[PDB]
Design an enzyme around this catalytic site. Structure first.
Site, PDB file in Angstrom:
ATOM      1  CG  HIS B  49      -1.443   0.978   0.979  1.00 38.43           C
ATOM      2  ND1 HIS B  49      -1.452   2.338   1.741  1.00 38.43           N
ATOM      3  CD2 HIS B  49      -3.155   0.990   0.180  1.00 38.43           C
ATOM      4  CE1 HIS B  49      -2.753   3.186   2.043  1.00 38.43           C
ATOM      5  NE2 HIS B  49      -3.199   3.006   1.031  1.00 38.43           N
ATOM      6  CD  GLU B  52      -2.862   2.419  -4.083  1.00 38.75           C
ATOM      7  OE1 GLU B  52      -3.188   1.331  -3.581  1.00 38.75           O
ATOM      8  OE2 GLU B  52      -3.327   2.487  -4.616  1.00 38.75           O
ATOM      9  CG  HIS B  53       0.046   5.952  -0.436  1.00 36.40           C
ATOM     10  ND1 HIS B  53      -0.519   7.426   0.241  1.00 36.40           N
ATOM     11  CD2 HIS B  53      -0.823   5.157  -0.091  1.00 36.40           C
ATOM     12  CE1 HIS B  53      -1.245   7.393   0.705  1.00 36.40           C
ATOM     13  NE2 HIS B  53      -1.224   5.657   1.156  1.00 36.40           N
ATOM     14  CD  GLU B 122       2.705   9.950  -0.011  1.00 35.18           C
ATOM     15  OE1 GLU B 122       1.746   9.695   0.042  1.00 35.18           O
ATOM     16  OE2 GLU B 122       2.838  11.279   0.161  1.00 35.18           O
ATOM     17  CD  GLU B 129      -4.341   6.873   2.770  1.00 31.61           C
ATOM     18  OE1 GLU B 129      -2.948   5.772   3.040  1.00 31.61           O
ATOM     19  OE2 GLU B 129      -4.571   6.027   2.585  1.00 31.61           O
TER      20      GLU B 129
END
Ligand SMILES: CCCCCCCCCCCCCCCCCCCC(=O)O[C@H](COC(=O)CCCCCCCCCCCCCC)COP(=O)(O)OCCN
Lengths: 53, 438
Positions: B49, B52-53, B122, B129
């Site tokens: 994940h 993906e960022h 990030e 999140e």
């Protein structure tokens, strides 16, 4: 001995029926313990995580 | 009759699969990867994940800003998602902007910077999140559902990963993940809409030819999950709506019971009080629920993975004193898949599904998603003729036999969120998985 029999003539039958009852009831007691523990295990095993709001 | 899906390979083992539609003017090209969170261990859980960022944070050529501009200038958009078993990166564009989009995708996958400065930036975004998924109740429910059903196993882990890992993910482990997993034999380049297959194969030879091949190439959609009957209760009295999921272990993509499980799921079906037609649906559960106001909605599901699945239902309700009735009637409808279903329900569900499986594919992105999913789970696109034949092969005997081995008297995984005081304990729910009268 004879007079004891006269007072309680069911004596012999009673004690034999009692042996059958003891055996059945004891087995049922054992099984009832297993079944209770089986059914209660989700409650006994429950765990919590608390995050204060 | 839809156009044929063309399929080619490169030498490295990258599959190219395309389905042209000369009636549209847009195209969706992208890369479907047979890899996801399930490929992480406990220490690097969250890496897929995280990547993906970073994929959109700049490459060896284009910086973050240049990347933004290049896509803006293309005119369409790029999108990505990471799941437990699948990663997708696609680009929707105009017909003649397809070579640009393939080139950008090839760049962000092969040649991403993963600069320590961007990792660090990030690391906060992703940390935030963790505290905002909390609002998406359906996702909260399904993530707890996987966590408990596959307790301490790779399918049970979340995609975001723990807070601890987010703070310790390095560019090294990111690079290692994508080097081990994003190999050519696990990847499919997919084009749908206004694409020529032969053009797409040339673009693949131009951009994706220097992709690593894995040492041991297994076929696409190659995987042992041990389901745990269990429950998670997240009671919150301040929420007005209860969200409940109940599932049993279901079927994998390649199960022989894959279609039988879909038909059984269609017999229960979905319901939503806000849709006008839902009060008139044929499903028995739908009729019980609507007549008695037991729920705002329910949605049956049959999720598949490479080696397992979850089959069950997701319910939402404001009726907090009749949650017991809602759960009771739902599980009694499941019991009837074992005891009572006949050709009446089975043929009705087959009718509804024969159309449903075709209806779903109504845009280029849906078509691309269908080609990509099928190629990465089954190794081939299954033609509608084959799908029609497999559905037709499902009889009422198959449904009853499947339900008797999968549902009847089986352990469930159960998640409840919200005002769920009325949801009874595990035993009373699990006792509804059988009927004493049968
Ligand atoms: C009223 C008092 C209740 C307590 C009963 C305890 C024993 C009484 C049973 C009579 C007796 O002597 O039975 C013995 C066996 O005991 C046993 O095996 C019986 C113990 C069973 C304990 C309770 C189980 C259910 C009983 C209550 C239900 C009654 C109504 C429900 C339909 C042997 O007698 P035998 O074997 O010669 O008998 C002929 C069939 N072979």
């Amino acid at each position: 001995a004879f007079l004891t029999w006269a007072a309680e003539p069911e004596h012999d039958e009673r004690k034999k029926l009692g042996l059958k009852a003891i055996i059945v009831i004891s087995a049922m007691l054992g099984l009832s313990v297993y079944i209770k523990k089986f059914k209660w295990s989700p409650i006994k095993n429950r765990k919590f995580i608390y995050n204060p709001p | 009759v839809s156009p044929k899906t063309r399929t080619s390979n490169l030498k490295n083992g990258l599959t190219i699969a395309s389905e042209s539609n000369p009636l549209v003017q847009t195209a969706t090209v992208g890369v479907w990867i047979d890899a996801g969170s399930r490929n992480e261990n406990a220490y690097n859980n969250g890496t897929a994940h995280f990547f993906e960022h970073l994929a959109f944070k700049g490459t060896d050529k284009r910086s973050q800003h240049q990347l933004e501009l290049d896509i803006e200038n293309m005119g369409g958009h790029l999108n990505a998602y990471t799941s437990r078993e699948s990663t997708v990166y696609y680009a929707k564009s105009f017909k003649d902007d397809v070579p640009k989009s393939v080139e950008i995708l090839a760049d962000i996958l092969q040649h991403s910077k993963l600069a320590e400065s961007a990792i660090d930036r990030e690391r906060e975004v992703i940390t935030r999140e963790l505290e905002e998924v909390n609002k998406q109740y359906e996702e909260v429910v399904f993530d707890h559902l996987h966590a408990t059903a596959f307790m301490n196993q790779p399918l049970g882990r979340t995609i975001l990963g723990p807070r601890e890992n987010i703070q310790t993910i390095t560019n090294t482990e990111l690079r290692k993940f994508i080097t081990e997993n994003y190999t050519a034999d696990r990847m499919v380049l997919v084009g749908a809409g206004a694409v020529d297959h032969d053009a797409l194969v040339e673009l693949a030879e131009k951009y994706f030819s220097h992709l690593p091949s894995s040492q041991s190439p297994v076929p696409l959609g190659t995987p042992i999950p041990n389901f745990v009957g269990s429950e998670v209760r997240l009671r919150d009295d301040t929420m007005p709506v209860a969200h409940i999921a109940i599932a049993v272990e279901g079927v994998s993509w390649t199960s022989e019971d894959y279609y039988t499980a879909l038909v059984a799921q269609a017999i229960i079906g979905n319901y939503d009080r806000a849709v006008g037609t839902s009060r008139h649906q044929g499903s028995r559960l739908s009729n019980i629920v609507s007549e008695n106001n037991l729920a705002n909605s329910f949605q049956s599901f049959s999720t598949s993975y490479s080696d397992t699945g979850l089959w069950g239902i997701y319910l939402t309700s404001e009726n907090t004193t009749q949650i017991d009735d809602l759960v009771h009637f739902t599980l009694k409808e499941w019991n009837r898949l074992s005891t009572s279903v006949s050709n009446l329900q089975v043929e009705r569900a087959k009718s509804q599904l024969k159309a449903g499986l075709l209806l779903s594919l109504d845009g280029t992105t849906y078509v691309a998603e269908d080609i990509g999913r099928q190629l990465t789970t089954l190794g081939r696109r299954v033609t509608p003729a084959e799908v029609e034949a497999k559905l037709e092969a499902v009889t009422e005997h198959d449904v009853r036999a499947w339900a008797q081995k999968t549902l009847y008297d089986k352990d469930i995984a159960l998640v409840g969120l919200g005002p769920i005081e009325g949801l009874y304990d595990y035993n009373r729910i699990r006792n509804d998985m059988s009927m004493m009268r049968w």
